[PDB]
């Protein structure tokens, strides 16, 4: 129940730590001083620390009322860190589930969900972040992991957030799904345009390029410069611009700050298309 949600080390390695703390409590019956230092040394993560102490409370040898002298350690760790601790505990199983699927270290996922419900960066900055931390191939699965954890988090006896906060989280989640939606669309356009066949252009770099457009529509042209310096060797400008324009048109509207911001992006990309298609006549 508690040992399974510990994401620090191998199954035996974990067990080699719990019993020692049970040892310093049952047959030795010593005091609690450097005990905490050893606990923290064994487990660097507060969630894993609490889980270890909870397992200690599952032993048969109740030495009477030292339960309160042990639960004070549980509450001292939790107090003032209720959000982080609970976020780690509740999403542990999912971290192990998705970790095996994606071939990623579970505790990395715990940090992911932890940071998501505790941070306050924009929707686009989040997508970008997850991209850089977990890679191109995991970008759609990572959002699924966060969703699954949120569901479990909510159904937990001691959730990480309150009713109000979970609403905001969801709202952020939906914003992310919209980005994933445009991402999926953008990728389909790249395939049909045959911009990935050459092998010179990176779909990750192109994805980020689209993401920058969302944040700074006024600087669209400047942003696309990086792509042009590579696409010119094989493809024609109008083709790259069309991919971005048609993608933006078919993507959800609320990805942009506002209606006017979106039109700034569209008009600029519209002008870019015309200009390139014109220069293609003098060739």
Residue numbers in the entry: 73 to 355
Please quote the paper that reports this structure.
In order to improve the quality of MxiC crystals, a shortened construct encompassing residues 74–355 (MxiCNΔ73) was expressed, purified and subjected to crystallization trials. Reductive methylation of MxiCNΔ73 yielded crystals that diffracted to higher resolution: 2.85 Å and 2.5 Å in space groups P212121 and P222, respectively. The first and last domains consist only of the X-bundle motif while the central domain also possesses a bent helix (α5) that is packed against domain 1. It is the first two domains of MxiC that are equivalent to YopN while the third domain of MxiC, equivalent to TyeA, is connected to domain 2 via a ten-residue linker. There are a total of seven independent MxiC molecules in the crystallographic asymmetric units of the three refined crystal forms. These structures reveal that, although the fold of each domain is maintained in all structures (rmsd over Cα atoms of domains 1, 2 and 3 are 0.5 Å, 0.9 Å and 0.8 Å, respectively), there is some flexibility at the interfaces between domains resulting in a “wobble” of the terminal domains about the central domain (rmsd over all Cα atoms of 1.4 Å). Interestingly, mapping of sequence conservation onto the structure across the more closely related Salmonella, Burkholderia and Shigella species reveals a hydrophobic patch on the surface of the central domain consisting of residues Leu222, Met226, Gly239, Leu242 and Leu245 (red circle). This region is buried by crystal contacts in all seven independent molecules of MxiC in the P212121, P222 and P43212 crystal forms, suggesting that this region may be a “hot spot” for protein–protein interactions. Surprisingly, the most striking difference instead involves the long á-helix (α9) in the central domain of MxiC, which is straight in all of our MxiC structures, but possesses a sharp kink in YopN when complexed with TyeA. As the sequence at the hinge is not conserved, and all MxiC molecules possess the straight helix conformation, these structures may represent genuine differences between species.
The pathogenicity of Shigella sp. is dependent on a complex macromolecular machine, the type 3 secretion system (T3SS), that delivers into host cells a set of effector proteins required for invasion. Blockage of effector secretion before host cell contact is mediated, in part, by a protein that has been proposed to act as either a physical impediment to the entrance to the secretion apparatus, or as a gatekeeper that determines substrate hierarchy. Across bacterial species, this protein (known as MxiC in Shigella sp.) possesses only weak sequence homology and in some species exists as two separate polypeptide chains (e.g., in Yersinia sp. the homologue consists of YopN and TyeA). MxiC is an elongated rod-shaped molecule with a long axis of 86 Å.
